[PDB]
């Protein structure tokens, strides 16, 4: 029963806060189109660690940019576990009780001089407190690093639609843009 949830991705300098009934694509609508969906290559190539890194241009006017990811546990559970009753008001509890502890693995590098680094935060949206929770803080350089973390039980990170929202907060500092190379992104769970 061990498994991974791999790659909606959206790049923007605007802050999005999902609601309890927020769907996958509401990020683009909430930003008035002041951002872009990640390229097809991001969905194709970030599902395993190899030499094929996906480069993403993080434009910013404020010195901060965001890469949002949305993971739909309803469609995942319907595909891999159609026997689970996802129509109940308890579906978030059922899915979280089923997954138990979730870990995020996220391998990335920055297209910057090898002697420089930028601050990056991995965040998950907590619907119990209606805020972005920082689960990892790292300095990202030219060298690839996993910035992933174990986030534990996902019940409070799931909305009514069983969507989980994650983001990278990327502090470009005084730069108008920073390019990020993404090698691997995986939401991995292990239960008995």
């Amino acid at each position: 029963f061990y498994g991974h949830i791999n790659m909606y991705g959206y790049v923007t300098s605007y802050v999005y806060n999902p609601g309890m009934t927020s769907s996958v694509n509401q990020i683009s609508a909430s930003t008035e189109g002041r951002g872009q969906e990640v390229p097809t290559d991001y969905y194709m190539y970030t599902s395993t660690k190899n030499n094929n890194t996906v480069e993403l241009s993080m434009q910013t006017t404020s010195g901060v940019s965001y890469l949002y990811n949305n993971f739909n546990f309803r469609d995942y559970m319907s595909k891999y576990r159609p026997q689970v009753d996802l129509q109940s008001d308890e579906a978030r509890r059922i899915v979280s009780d089923y997954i138990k502890e979730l870990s995020i693995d996220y391998y990335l590098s920055a297209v910057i001089p090898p002697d420089e680094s930028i601050e990056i935060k991995l965040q998950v949206y907590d619907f119990s407190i209606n805020r972005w929770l920082t689960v990892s803080i790292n300095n990202l350089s030219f060298y690839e690093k996993n910035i992933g973390s174990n986030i534990g039980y996902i019940k409070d990170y799931l909305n009514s639609e069983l969507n989980m929202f994650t983001r990278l907060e990327i502090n470009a500092g005084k730069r108008d843009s920073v390019d990020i190379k993404v090698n691997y992104l995986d939401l991995m769970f292990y239960y008995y």
Binding site: Y2, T48, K49, M188, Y190
Partner: protein, 176 residues
């Protein structure tokens, strides 16, 4: 229309009748992407990744679940904390034996030393001219036959002080 439990007994007997052609095989000598969490197998494949070699199946038999007192005079198979009893082909319908137990053992460098991860079974294998030994590296095989069954375990490593006693209990219909 329907088939029967007795058909699964007869197809188990067929697989057991092939035993002279049956070898355990092991493979995947290089790492997984992470050794703790292997990738899923492929039931349409007919050979292992990174094939280390073949060893003749030391024991091919029918089984059923064990019970006492009526299996006390018999011999029992233990695996995965489960405990099972052996059945001979001419008794298979009377005992109801539709489960096959497959076992082989390797010790030392009689197949190449290193780590192993993929485990499985082949039948209708043919060895090359001038060779008759029960341990084969792939260079010694004329035809690999059909790879029937395989799995993607977490690894282990080998020497003369270790026994590669891998086994399956398999069934041709798990959900009648």
């Amino acid at each position: 229309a329907i088939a029967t439990y007795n058909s699964h007994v007869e197809l188990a007997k067929y697989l057991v009748s092939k035993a002279d052609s049956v070898y355990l095989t092991i493979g995947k000598s290089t790492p997984w992407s992470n050794e703790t969490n292997p990738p899923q197998p492929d039931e349409n494949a007919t050979v292992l990744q990174e094939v280390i070699g073949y060893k003749k199946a030391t024991k091919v038999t029918l089984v059923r679940p064990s019970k006492s007192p009526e299996d006390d005079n018999k011999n029992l198979i233990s695996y995965g904390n489960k405990s099972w009893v052996e059945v001979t082909p001419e008794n298979a319908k009377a005992e109801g034996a539709k489960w096959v137990y497959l076992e082989s053992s390797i010790v030392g460098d009689e197949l190449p030393l290193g780590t192993y991860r993929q485990v499985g079974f082949v039948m209708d294998l043919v060895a090359k001219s001038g060779i008759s030994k029960f341990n084969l590296v792939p260079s010694e095989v004329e035809s690999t036959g059909t790879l029937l069954f395989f799995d993607n375990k977490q690894f282990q490593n080998r020497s003369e002080q270790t026994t590669a006693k891998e086994r399956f209990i398999v069934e041709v219909d798990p959900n009648s």
